[PDB]
Amino acid sequence: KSERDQLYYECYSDVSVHEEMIADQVRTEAYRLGILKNWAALRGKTVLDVGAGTGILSIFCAQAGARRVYAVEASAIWQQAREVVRLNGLEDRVHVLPGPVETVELPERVDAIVSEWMGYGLLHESMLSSVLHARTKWLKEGGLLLPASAELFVAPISDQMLEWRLGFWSQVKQHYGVDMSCMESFATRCLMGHSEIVVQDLSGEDVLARPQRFAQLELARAGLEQELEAGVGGRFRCSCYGSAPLHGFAVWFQVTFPGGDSEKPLVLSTSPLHPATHWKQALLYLNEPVPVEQDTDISGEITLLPSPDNPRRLRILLRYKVGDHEEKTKDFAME
Amino acid sequence: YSDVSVHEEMIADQVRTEAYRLGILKNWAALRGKTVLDVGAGTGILSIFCAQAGARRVYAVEASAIWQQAREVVRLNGLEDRVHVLPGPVETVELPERVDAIVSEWMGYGLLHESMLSSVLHARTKWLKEGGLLLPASAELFVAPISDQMLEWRLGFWSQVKQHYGVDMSCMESFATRCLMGHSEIVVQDLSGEDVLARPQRFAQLELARAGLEQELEAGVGGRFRCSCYGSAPLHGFAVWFQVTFPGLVLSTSPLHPATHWKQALLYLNEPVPVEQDTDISGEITLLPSPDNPRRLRILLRYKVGDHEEKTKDFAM
Ligand SMILES: COC(=O)c1cc(O)c2cc(NC(=O)NCCCCCNC(=N)NC[C@H]3O[C@@H](n4cnc5c(N)ncnc54)[C@H](O)[C@@H]3O)ccc2c1
Ligand SMILES: COC(=O)c1cc(O)c2cc(NC(=O)NCCCCCNC(=N)NC[C@H]3O[C@@H](n4cnc5c(N)ncnc54)[C@H](O)[C@@H]3O)ccc2c1
Secondary structure: OHHHHHHHHHHHHOHHHHHHHHHOHHHHHHHHHHHHOOHHHHOOOEEEEEOOOOOHHHHHHHHOOOOEEEEEEOOOOHHHHHHHHHHOOOOOOEEEEEOOOOOOOOOOOEEEEEOOOOEOOEOOOOOHHHHHHHHHHHEEEEEEEEOOEEEEEEEEEOOHHHHHHHHHHHHHHHHHOOOOHHHHHHHHHHHHOOOEEEEEOOOHHHEOEOOEEEEEEEOOOOOHHHHHHHOEEEEEEEEEOOOEEEEEEEEEEEEEEEEEEOOEEEEEEOOOOOOOOOOOEEEEEEEEEEEEOOOOEEEEEEEEEEOOOOOOOEEEEEEEEEOOOOOEEEEEEEO | OOOHHHHHHHHHOHHHHHHHHHHHHOOHHHHOOOEEEEEOOOOOHHHHHHHHOOOOEEEEEEOOOOHHHHHHHHHHOOOOOOEEEEEOOOOOOOOOOOEEEEEOOOOEOOEOOOOOHHHHHHHHHHHEEEEEEEEOOEEEEEEEEEOOHHHHHHHHHHHHHHHHHOOOOOOHHHHHHHHHHOOOEOEEEOOOHHHEOOOOEEEEEEEOOOOOHHHHHHHOEEEEEEEEOOOOEEEEEEEEEEEEEOOOOEEEOOOOOOOOOOOEEEEEEEEEEEEOOOOEEEEEEEEEEEOOEEEEEEEEEEEEEOOOOOEEEEEEO
């Protein structure tokens, strides 16, 4: 454990992870707009930014009219956040505070919490439990969470990139004159027989059926933290668009910002159908391709769990049934 | 190496694989009717090229479980009479005879990181007939001072945030510079010709036929260099790359030649150093086994930029 905590401290004390997040234009613009559109809720109010990093979101809250923002950041990057806030002339309004949000002392309960807390597959090494701790300890009753909720989606996939990698061996002879098609079964076992979650970018063309929402996390609910331990998940059914080898499933998330249209709020999506983000998607490969047809029914249950060795390490239990075949299960973990 | 991904990367490196193919096939005269040992044959592809070049026999020695797939590949291609996959380390496999030629793809990042060179040298001692053919036969090491456009972009990102999002983050630049260059790691990254700040300098050569080479690697291989800069730019450090030469044809990982999966090994100074046209840079580069692990590459860099005093930086992979 203390080895892991040291690793995360070093990672977020370093520039590259913050450069990745801020260069994620879809992510950073979504937060900027979700915050600024909530000026009515934030004007003259106080904000707690959980895991403020470089402090950019806290400054977005100040530009939306917040009177006080507490930017709490555990890693050594809090010192760069202090400099950034000072450079923008905002240190009277935005107060960068080092250390974990779980032991920070604030002058006051706050009107709003903002946080970019999401990990790969939503819950791998995420900040969610810190956000929920902060909501319990520091958010006023009736206060605002930005974003307010997260939604999880699944879809069966035919991964064009995996198809290529699997067909690679049969294509050697055409380029180099050596028949290597006998490597195909071997490559399939290596590339699909493992039980690791694969974080890879997909395109809409890989999606084999209508994507299905299978879970929703309402961050304001008390006891959501207890559900995380038992597992975040749900059941799904869909019907395939057409003929293709089924390779498994893609899991992705979106988060929703309150305010604006109460039936059309602002959404930051990591769907393969939407512009790419640094989160990509979480791929769950079957042990081998399964041939499927138009209107082939696929159903099952997907549960996101902590790993036994490490509560921060995402585990996914997949139970699934492809049309006629018998129900199968596969148990995945993030590497 | 029991897994497909490294072998797929290897064969999908088109510059590498076509250069090996041609290095072998263009040596048809020297290989016709001769015997070959393929050291670490992997999937067996190079062994089959040797058969197309007219070798009368190829022993394909492979220590990892992938030898079972190479046996299948050989059989599938109709060459089981002529290409014999032998499992296990080349140090202890027993060949029926000494061979006329050795083929091997042994090179690592920075040439010698986690490479197969030691096993090629062992096989040469034990099984190559006198003056036998080595494919490739030699490796050449090159260094060039660099101004890394990607690093510049990464360092300049923070000053661009005020435009992208209305928040000034220019103060992050010194921090990013320290993070991205203050470390002592070798960085494997592909550069382009635009990054090269002076004429590349060959600083060492390795002759694979030589009996003393294995003990020489332990002491380090390298040597001095001198160059003068093309123009004004911030010097970020040096790039180290290699080529291998087949007896007559060169497989190059230069940033000035088509990209390969080896990319180049980048050696960043602690911070950028301004340089101008004809600024003189001299120094020495040594490739060494690291103390904790002889397979891990260490590079000791000594360097003098124009008037500045001579400095040292000690990198590891
Ligand atoms: C006295 O002991 C405790 O009570 C205690 C002590 C601890 O060390 C605790 C460590 C926790 N977790 C963690 O270390 N996670 C690391 C990976 C973050 C996930 C990726 N999300 C993400 N994009 N991060 C954005 C920024 O959030 C920053 N950050 C991350 N977590 C926090 C946090 N709790 N408060 C403030 N800042 C935080 C990061 O540095 C990063 O810059 C949890 C609870 C903890 C409780
Ligand atoms: C008395 O025992 C020893 O002293 C000894 C010495 C060794 O180096 C041993 C190495 C082993 N395996 C491995 O993975 N080592 C990782 C480093 C290779 C990085 C670069 N290699 C590369 N470009 N790939 C070509 C192919 O060469 C294959 N290979 C690699 N080395 C050999 C070898 N000695 N004979 C035959 N085949 C070999 C690989 O499997 C790969 O498929 C196992 C056992 C070994 C035992």
